[PDB]
Amino acid sequence: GSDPAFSQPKSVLDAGLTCQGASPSSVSKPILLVPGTGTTGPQSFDSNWIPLSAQLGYTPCWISPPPFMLNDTQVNTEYMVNAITTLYAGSGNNKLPVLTVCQGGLVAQWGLTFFPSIRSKVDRLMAFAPDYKGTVLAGPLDALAGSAPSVWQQTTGSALTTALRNAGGLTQIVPTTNLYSATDEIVQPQVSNSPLDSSYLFNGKNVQAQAVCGPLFVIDHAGSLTSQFSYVVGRSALRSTTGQARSADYGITDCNPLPANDLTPEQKVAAAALLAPYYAAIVAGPKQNCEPDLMPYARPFAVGKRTCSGIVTP
Ligand code: NI
């Protein structure tokens, strides 16, 4: 039951993977970091989970799909599937955690859905503000002529989010923890604490910040990745014997929306001013006049949706 074929040559996918202080071919305790839209690996995790996971005993690794995750999401997924295949064997055929933010969570779940070979190679998934259903703040699909391919695909009602949904991709495939906020200014809707939210996965550990820390708790898109509450939740997921964050680990002791306590003062300042969410506004990306066609492995699950070739059919 082979994997679908990569549209990209494997050497191009290998050029996006980097382990801090080790080689991806031979590494002990790796963790895969998948960045958000408009960012590279370092731009997303420089001030937070690259130094934080290193203190927890992991070798930080990450992918940086070019250019800044603005290309087709299904191509960004190839970088991740190649990265886990590499890191899993690189640690001697041992599962590894994967930690994501924004489109990274949608990339992680796309790869787990359509590339079965990696499903038993990810130990657990820890996703901060993932947009599995996309976002409504991306505008209507009929006013994005020229916008980046991934911006088309993360627009609510896209063929990509439709196919992921109908393929069974809104169910956790490996042990997953999703930490998100109702006050996410990038990903909406996030207010229901229910399967209506873009970050919700069926059977996962879905942690909406306001459900733990109260409705008046305010935490933005970037804060969802760097807050002390995010660190304590993220650390519970990684150390858990269930592979999901445990409600007994974190609690209301931890409801602090500022950069993680174990960060340095320099790394706390950089995390409190992280503009990566809005970095894309200045970066030049690809041009796209219609939603990118779905790869043949996902086309059946979005029948009736409109992409560049026309209305998808069986
Ligand atoms: Ni983002």
Short mmCIF file of C-alpha atoms and ligand atoms in Angstrom, two decimals, residues 36-37 101-103 186 221 276-277, ligand 1:
data_model
loop_
_atom_site.label_atom_id
_atom_site.label_comp_id
_atom_site.label_asym_id
_atom_site.label_seq_id
_atom_site.Cartn_x
_atom_site.Cartn_y
_atom_site.Cartn_z
CA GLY A 36 3.86 28.64 10.12
CA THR A 37 2.77 30.57 7.04
CA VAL A 101 2.51 26.11 14.41
CA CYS A 102 -0.23 27.46 12.08
CA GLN A 103 -0.01 25.81 8.61
CA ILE A 186 -5.13 35.00 12.48
CA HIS A 221 -1.64 33.84 17.58
CA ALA A 276 6.20 36.00 12.24
CA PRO A 277 2.35 35.74 11.97
NI NI B 1 0.80 31.79 11.69
#
